Design a protein around this nucleic acid. Structure first.
Ligand SMILES: [Mg+2]
Ligand SMILES: [Mg+2]
Ligand SMILES: [Mg+2]
Ligand SMILES: [Mg+2]
Ligand SMILES: [Mg+2]
Ligand SMILES: [Mg+2]
Ligand SMILES: [Mg+2]
Ligand SMILES: [Mg+2]
Ligand SMILES: [Mg+2]
Ligand SMILES: [Mg+2]
Ligand SMILES: [Mg+2]
Ligand SMILES: [Mg+2]
Ligand SMILES: [Mg+2]
Ligand SMILES: [Mg+2]
Ligand SMILES: [Mg+2]
Ligand SMILES: [Mg+2]
Ligand SMILES: [Mg+2]
Ligand SMILES: [Mg+2]
Ligand SMILES: [Mg+2]
Ligand SMILES: [Mg+2]
Ligand SMILES: [Mg+2]
Ligand SMILES: [Mg+2]
Ligand SMILES: [Mg+2]
Ligand SMILES: [Mg+2]
Ligand SMILES: [Mg+2]
Ligand SMILES: [Mg+2]
Ligand SMILES: [Mg+2]
Ligand SMILES: [Mg+2]
Ligand SMILES: [Mg+2]
Ligand SMILES: [Mg+2]
Ligand SMILES: [Mg+2]
Ligand SMILES: [Mg+2]
Ligand SMILES: [Mg+2]
Ligand SMILES: [Mg+2]
Ligand SMILES: [Mg+2]
Ligand SMILES: [Mg+2]
Ligand SMILES: [Mg+2]
Ligand SMILES: [Mg+2]
Ligand SMILES: [Mg+2]
Ligand SMILES: [Mg+2]
Ligand SMILES: [Mg+2]
Ligand SMILES: [Mg+2]
Ligand SMILES: [Mg+2]
Ligand SMILES: [Mg+2]
Ligand SMILES: [Mg+2]
Ligand SMILES: [Mg+2]
Ligand SMILES: [Mg+2]
Ligand SMILES: [Mg+2]
Ligand SMILES: [Mg+2]
Ligand SMILES: [Mg+2]
Ligand SMILES: [Mg+2]
Ligand SMILES: [Mg+2]
Ligand SMILES: [Mg+2]
Ligand SMILES: [Mg+2]
Ligand SMILES: [Mg+2]
Ligand SMILES: [Mg+2]
Ligand SMILES: [Mg+2]
Ligand SMILES: [Mg+2]
Ligand SMILES: [Mg+2]
Ligand SMILES: [Mg+2]
Ligand SMILES: [Mg+2]
Ligand SMILES: [Mg+2]
Ligand SMILES: [Mg+2]
Ligand SMILES: [Mg+2]
Ligand SMILES: [Mg+2]
Ligand SMILES: [Mg+2]
Ligand SMILES: [Mg+2]
Ligand SMILES: [Mg+2]
Ligand SMILES: [Mg+2]
Ligand SMILES: [Mg+2]
Ligand SMILES: [Mg+2]
Ligand SMILES: [Mg+2]
Ligand SMILES: [Mg+2]
Ligand SMILES: [Mg+2]
Ligand SMILES: [Mg+2]
Ligand SMILES: [Mg+2]
Ligand SMILES: [Mg+2]
Ligand SMILES: [Mg+2]
Ligand SMILES: [Mg+2]
Ligand SMILES: [Mg+2]
Ligand SMILES: [Mg+2]
Ligand SMILES: [Mg+2]
Ligand SMILES: [Mg+2]
Ligand SMILES: [Mg+2]
Ligand SMILES: [Mg+2]
Ligand SMILES: [Mg+2]
Ligand SMILES: [Mg+2]
Ligand SMILES: [Mg+2]
Ligand SMILES: [Mg+2]
Ligand SMILES: [Mg+2]
Ligand SMILES: [Mg+2]
Ligand SMILES: [Mg+2]
Ligand SMILES: [Mg+2]
Ligand SMILES: [Mg+2]
Ligand SMILES: [Mg+2]
Ligand SMILES: [Mg+2]
Ligand SMILES: [Mg+2]
Ligand SMILES: [Mg+2]
Ligand SMILES: [Mg+2]
Ligand SMILES: [Mg+2]
Ligand SMILES: [Mg+2]
Ligand SMILES: [Mg+2]
Ligand SMILES: [Mg+2]
Ligand SMILES: [Mg+2]
Ligand SMILES: [Mg+2]
Ligand SMILES: [Mg+2]
Ligand SMILES: [Mg+2]
Ligand SMILES: [Mg+2]
Ligand SMILES: [Mg+2]
Ligand SMILES: [Mg+2]
Ligand SMILES: [Mg+2]
Ligand SMILES: [Mg+2]
Ligand SMILES: [Mg+2]
Ligand SMILES: [Mg+2]
Ligand SMILES: [Mg+2]
Ligand SMILES: [Mg+2]
Ligand SMILES: [Mg+2]
Ligand SMILES: [Mg+2]
Ligand SMILES: [Mg+2]
Ligand SMILES: [Mg+2]
Ligand SMILES: [Mg+2]
Ligand SMILES: [Mg+2]
Ligand SMILES: [Mg+2]
Ligand SMILES: [Mg+2]
Ligand SMILES: [Mg+2]
Ligand SMILES: [Mg+2]
Ligand SMILES: [Mg+2]
Ligand SMILES: [Mg+2]
Ligand SMILES: [Mg+2]
Ligand SMILES: [Mg+2]
Ligand SMILES: [Mg+2]
Ligand SMILES: [Mg+2]
Ligand SMILES: [Mg+2]
Ligand SMILES: [Mg+2]
Ligand SMILES: [Mg+2]
Ligand SMILES: [Mg+2]
Ligand SMILES: [Mg+2]
Ligand SMILES: [Mg+2]
Ligand SMILES: [Mg+2]
Ligand SMILES: [Mg+2]
Ligand SMILES: [Mg+2]
Ligand SMILES: [Mg+2]
Ligand SMILES: [Mg+2]
Ligand SMILES: [Mg+2]
Ligand SMILES: [Mg+2]
Ligand SMILES: [Mg+2]
Ligand SMILES: [Mg+2]
Ligand SMILES: [Mg+2]
Ligand SMILES: [Mg+2]
Ligand SMILES: [Mg+2]
Ligand SMILES: [Mg+2]
Ligand SMILES: [Mg+2]
Ligand SMILES: [Mg+2]
Ligand SMILES: [Mg+2]
Ligand SMILES: [Mg+2]
Ligand SMILES: [Mg+2]
Ligand SMILES: [Mg+2]
Ligand SMILES: [Mg+2]
Ligand SMILES: [Mg+2]
Ligand SMILES: [Mg+2]
Ligand SMILES: [Mg+2]
Ligand SMILES: [Mg+2]
Ligand SMILES: [Mg+2]
Ligand SMILES: [Mg+2]
Ligand SMILES: [Mg+2]
Ligand SMILES: [Mg+2]
Ligand SMILES: [Mg+2]
Ligand SMILES: [Mg+2]
Ligand SMILES: [Mg+2]
Ligand SMILES: [Mg+2]
Ligand SMILES: [Mg+2]
Ligand SMILES: [Mg+2]
Ligand SMILES: [Mg+2]
Ligand SMILES: [Mg+2]
Ligand SMILES: [Mg+2]
Ligand SMILES: [Mg+2]
Ligand SMILES: [Mg+2]
Ligand SMILES: [Mg+2]
Ligand SMILES: [Mg+2]
Ligand SMILES: [Mg+2]
Ligand SMILES: [Mg+2]
Ligand SMILES: [Mg+2]
Ligand SMILES: [Mg+2]
Ligand SMILES: [Mg+2]
Ligand SMILES: [Mg+2]
Ligand SMILES: [Mg+2]
Ligand SMILES: [Mg+2]
Ligand SMILES: [Mg+2]
Ligand SMILES: [Mg+2]
Ligand SMILES: [Mg+2]
Ligand SMILES: [Mg+2]
Ligand SMILES: [Mg+2]
Ligand SMILES: [Mg+2]
Ligand SMILES: [Mg+2]
Ligand SMILES: [Mg+2]
Ligand SMILES: [Mg+2]
Ligand SMILES: [Mg+2]
Ligand SMILES: [Mg+2]
Ligand SMILES: [Mg+2]
Ligand SMILES: [Mg+2]
Ligand SMILES: [Mg+2]
Ligand SMILES: [Mg+2]
Ligand SMILES: [Mg+2]
Ligand SMILES: [Mg+2]
Ligand SMILES: [Mg+2]
Ligand SMILES: [Zn+2]
Lengths: 64, 53
RNA sequence: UGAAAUACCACCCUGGCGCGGCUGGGGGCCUAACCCUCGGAUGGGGGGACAGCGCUUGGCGGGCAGUUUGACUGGGGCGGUCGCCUCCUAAAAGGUAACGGAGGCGCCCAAAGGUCCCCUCAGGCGGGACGGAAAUCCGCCGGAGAGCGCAAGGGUAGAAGGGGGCCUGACUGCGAGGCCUGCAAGCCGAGCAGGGGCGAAAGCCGGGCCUAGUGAACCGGUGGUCCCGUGUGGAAGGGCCAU
RNA sequence: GUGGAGCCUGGGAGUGAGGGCGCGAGCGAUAACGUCCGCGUCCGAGCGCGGGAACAACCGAGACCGCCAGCUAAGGCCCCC
RNA sequence: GCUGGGGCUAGGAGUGAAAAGCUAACCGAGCCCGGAGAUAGCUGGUUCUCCCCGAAAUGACUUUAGGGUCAGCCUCAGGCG
RNA sequence: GUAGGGAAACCGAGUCCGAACAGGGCGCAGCGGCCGCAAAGUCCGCGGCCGUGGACCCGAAACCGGGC
RNA sequence: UGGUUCGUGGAGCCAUGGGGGAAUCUGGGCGGACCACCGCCUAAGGCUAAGUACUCCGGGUGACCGAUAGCGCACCAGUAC
RNA sequence: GGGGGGAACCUGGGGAACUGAAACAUCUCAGUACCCAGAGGAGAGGAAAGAGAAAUCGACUCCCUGAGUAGCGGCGAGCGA
């Protein structure tokens, strides 16, 4: 039967207009007091997943 | 960080918002930290005060 | 006269008493629900509003049920080990294994941080009350063998070492370009803007001589924000920023 | 330097038990067809061919098919040959 | 005490002067049908021909270590030159 | 499929972070002589591989239900 | 407690085992806690074709099988054993 | 009038486990297998105390779509209007 959308992927990740997979940087959910303002600021941005991992995630989103 | 080396927040004294997290040794420093920091809401430097984390 | 001032009329406090409603407990009795029993049963006898049983609360509970009970390893078990830092092994780029050889981390500092100004060690010899191998003082020699919070290595006085003054850049908003690299992480970073610190200034400042001092998600807390709000306005509860 | 070279994008893998030898070390006993790395090589997949009495990995050499033709390699040239 | 006939007790259950004994010739949980083609990171097996290329047994991480994901190495198509 | 960016309100060849008119992230643009050629995209056929099913085939020891 | 996409979630709705327990239209249920506004609907009685499912049975037809195939059985088969 | 029977289909009352989550308990397999009661050529459902945002629609059943959407979920595996 028809493939199901993986909802863990759908909730964490976005496929961009050209087919990149963009996610939120990790590492700032907690334990942030002794992290420089540089670490916190930069971890607040989106990044582009490396191609091998992006190809896997995209197959999980067959209808995006 | 330990039982005597606590983490804490710095609260802008004018607009009340907590803008900074840091640490101190409460044996060496029993009194509240007071430090002039740049507050991005007031957009200027302000005395910030130690507050419970 | 005090703050208030009187006889009498209320209403209400105070705290208690006697009646009463309404129950909350307890003690005693009763009989009729309910239970037991009796050649007799629309009855008599016994128990009795308990016990049994229904719903719900917490508790004890291998009698039973489903399972869990790590890996490496000169076989397995036992012992040891599991992440991170330093040195060697490592064959002069990088990287490189063994239950190979040695150590250390799971902290700390409100200054042990920024800037400005100043200062220079250990050690050896001679000399000086108590005062010594070694306390403090004076001279001469002494490039770094001292110091740099803590392992080791690198680095270092033309300071990163010692002292003082003013300070909070132990910034907010970003970030060219790179190191490293399977991912995800880790690392370095000029410069631009906001508002500052020190300095006459050139300038420096996004913690600490550097390399360990750490933990991805999920779930939840707290402070902001005022973005969503299930017909509508709110609210409930979410999101976003910070921890 | 034109090579079954290199680079970019994408489709399909398989492999993640290696092993011997030479050199450089550690471990072991300046032991092991021992073990664990590094550089290389061959076997693996060339148990096809010549030599080494026989013999994956030593020496020689990379088998498209055929020939009762010639030259060589290592190794050999008394006989088995 | 032994024995005939007639009866009752069974599967997490019986029965057991206790051996986990016996419950229809294998009982630490009977047999049959069914869920059912359970599941098996294990072992085995996998069928015509010819042509070209042609690996790996490493690294990281892994309740991981004879299994995997990614990278490395092979192969095909397009492109670059 | 023809628009993307943002958690979203929303805005839109832009948008998000931001005080920024700063910087960055993710985005935005045919060949020939009106024509032919080609193409975004999409539809169908064919083929490789993937997902869901027992999913290349055979094989447990077992677990459960209902009966004997 | 169950049903629903809803596994306690902000948890409404529909169903109900236990306890409490109404009203007759100005009555009552719903629009996802709740309150207001605005709308929708009329619970606690019952019935109702057709369109849908299946294939013991009859027929029609196959880029379905052809006796190890096709039903377990082409034949005296749910038989012998 | 009832009783019993009928391949499969249907409704109601009860209701697993292997398995998947590369262990496992919530979760999944699944209200499936299966037992039982009842129905009939069908059964169930059915004439709004409906939907839910349309100032709207207008019983029920069934197919296509909406849609693997909205959501649910040790926010895992998966489930799924
Ligand atoms: Mg999720
Ligand atoms: Mg994060
Ligand atoms: Mg975390
Ligand atoms: Mg956070
Ligand atoms: Mg958060
Ligand atoms: Mg720090
Ligand atoms: Mg900082
Ligand atoms: Mg900070
Ligand atoms: Mg920020
Ligand atoms: Mg779609
Ligand atoms: Mg009495
Ligand atoms: Mg009595
Ligand atoms: Mg009595
Ligand atoms: Mg009682
Ligand atoms: Mg009773
Ligand atoms: Mg109660
Ligand atoms: Mg209890
Ligand atoms: Mg117990
Ligand atoms: Mg047990
Ligand atoms: Mg279970
Ligand atoms: Mg199980
Ligand atoms: Mg466990
Ligand atoms: Mg355990
Ligand atoms: Mg364990
Ligand atoms: Mg093991
Ligand atoms: Mg083991
Ligand atoms: Mg051993
Ligand atoms: Mg082993
Ligand atoms: Mg061995
Ligand atoms: Mg041995
Ligand atoms: Mg070993
Ligand atoms: Mg042990
Ligand atoms: Mg070295
Ligand atoms: Mg080295
Ligand atoms: Mg080296
Ligand atoms: Mg070298
Ligand atoms: Mg490199
Ligand atoms: Mg060991
Ligand atoms: Mg000072
Ligand atoms: Mg220091
Ligand atoms: Mg001296
Ligand atoms: Mg002296
Ligand atoms: Mg003296
Ligand atoms: Mg002296
Ligand atoms: Mg020194
Ligand atoms: Mg020390
Ligand atoms: Mg100083
Ligand atoms: Mg100073
Ligand atoms: Mg001043
Ligand atoms: Mg960069
Ligand atoms: Mg990287
Ligand atoms: Mg690191
Ligand atoms: Mg770090
Ligand atoms: Mg400035
Ligand atoms: Mg300035
Ligand atoms: Mg300035
Ligand atoms: Mg000045
Ligand atoms: Mg300046
Ligand atoms: Mg700077
Ligand atoms: Mg430090
Ligand atoms: Mg310093
Ligand atoms: Mg989880
Ligand atoms: Mg949360
Ligand atoms: Mg709003
Ligand atoms: Mg509003
Ligand atoms: Mg509303
Ligand atoms: Mg209002
Ligand atoms: Mg309000
Ligand atoms: Mg809110
Ligand atoms: Mg944060
Ligand atoms: Mg080639
Ligand atoms: Mg291809
Ligand atoms: Mg293929
Ligand atoms: Mg593979
Ligand atoms: Mg393999
Ligand atoms: Mg392996
Ligand atoms: Mg291996
Ligand atoms: Mg091996
Ligand atoms: Mg090995
Ligand atoms: Mg090896
Ligand atoms: Mg060797
Ligand atoms: Mg030699
Ligand atoms: Mg050697
Ligand atoms: Mg060595
Ligand atoms: Mg010897
Ligand atoms: Mg060997
Ligand atoms: Mg050897
Ligand atoms: Mg050796
Ligand atoms: Mg080798
Ligand atoms: Mg092999
Ligand atoms: Mg050879
Ligand atoms: Mg070869
Ligand atoms: Mg050979
Ligand atoms: Mg051979
Ligand atoms: Mg040979
Ligand atoms: Mg020979
Ligand atoms: Mg010979
Ligand atoms: Mg040989
Ligand atoms: Mg040999
Ligand atoms: Mg050849
Ligand atoms: Mg000749
Ligand atoms: Mg010769
Ligand atoms: Mg000879
Ligand atoms: Mg001769
Ligand atoms: Mg007898
Ligand atoms: Mg008998
Ligand atoms: Mg008998
Ligand atoms: Mg019996
Ligand atoms: Mg008995
Ligand atoms: Mg029985
Ligand atoms: Mg049994
Ligand atoms: Mg049984
Ligand atoms: Mg059993
Ligand atoms: Mg007996
Ligand atoms: Mg039998
Ligand atoms: Mg038996
Ligand atoms: Mg027997
Ligand atoms: Mg027996
Ligand atoms: Mg058993
Ligand atoms: Mg059966
Ligand atoms: Mg099954
Ligand atoms: Mg089987
Ligand atoms: Mg199955
Ligand atoms: Mg299993
Ligand atoms: Mg086959
Ligand atoms: Mg070839
Ligand atoms: Mg090799
Ligand atoms: Mg390996
Ligand atoms: Mg990894
Ligand atoms: Mg591990
Ligand atoms: Mg683990
Ligand atoms: Mg490992
Ligand atoms: Mg395995
Ligand atoms: Mg691969
Ligand atoms: Mg290559
Ligand atoms: Mg190649
Ligand atoms: Mg490729
Ligand atoms: Mg090509
Ligand atoms: Mg070429
Ligand atoms: Mg579209
Ligand atoms: Mg969006
Ligand atoms: Mg904003
Ligand atoms: Mg832009
Ligand atoms: Mg750009
Ligand atoms: Mg065309
Ligand atoms: Mg086309
Ligand atoms: Mg594929
Ligand atoms: Mg299946
Ligand atoms: Mg199967
Ligand atoms: Mg299959
Ligand atoms: Mg398949
Ligand atoms: Mg058995
Ligand atoms: Mg089980
Ligand atoms: Mg079991
Ligand atoms: Mg069992
Ligand atoms: Mg049974
Ligand atoms: Mg309820
Ligand atoms: Mg419920
Ligand atoms: Mg439920
Ligand atoms: Mg929830
Ligand atoms: Mg609900
Ligand atoms: Mg009720
Ligand atoms: Mg209710
Ligand atoms: Mg009304
Ligand atoms: Mg009313
Ligand atoms: Mg109601
Ligand atoms: Mg209600
Ligand atoms: Mg409604
Ligand atoms: Mg309501
Ligand atoms: Mg509402
Ligand atoms: Mg309505
Ligand atoms: Mg009709
Ligand atoms: Mg009908
Ligand atoms: Mg009909
Ligand atoms: Mg029909
Ligand atoms: Mg027929
Ligand atoms: Mg025929
Ligand atoms: Mg025959
Ligand atoms: Mg036959
Ligand atoms: Mg025949
Ligand atoms: Mg047959
Ligand atoms: Mg027949
Ligand atoms: Mg016969
Ligand atoms: Mg009947
Ligand atoms: Mg049912
Ligand atoms: Mg019934
Ligand atoms: Mg039920
Ligand atoms: Mg059961
Ligand atoms: Mg289960
Ligand atoms: Mg299954
Ligand atoms: Mg699965
Ligand atoms: Mg499992
Ligand atoms: Mg599994
Ligand atoms: Mg298991
Ligand atoms: Mg279920
Ligand atoms: Mg049923
Ligand atoms: Mg069935
Ligand atoms: Mg009946
Ligand atoms: Mg019947
Ligand atoms: Mg009909
Ligand atoms: Mg009917
Ligand atoms: Mg009806
Ligand atoms: Mg009606
Ligand atoms: Mg759609
Ligand atoms: Mg379900
Ligand atoms: Zn402020």
């Amino acid at each position: 039967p028809k493939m199901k959308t993986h909802k863990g992927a759908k909730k964490r990740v976005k496929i961009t207009a050209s087919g990149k997979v963009v996610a939120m940087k990790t590492g700032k959910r907690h334990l942030n007091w002794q992290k420089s303002g540089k670490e916190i600021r930069q971890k607040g941005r989106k990044f582009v997943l490396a191609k091998p991992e992006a190809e896997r995630i995209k197959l999980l989103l067959p209808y995006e | 960080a330990s039982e005597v080396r606590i983490k804490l927040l710095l609260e802008c004294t004018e607009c009340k918002r907590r803008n900074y997290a840091t640490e101190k040794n409460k044996r060496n420093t029993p009194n509240k930290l007071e430090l002039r920091k740049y507050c991005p809401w007031c957009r200027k430097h302000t005395v910030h005060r130690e507050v419970k984390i």
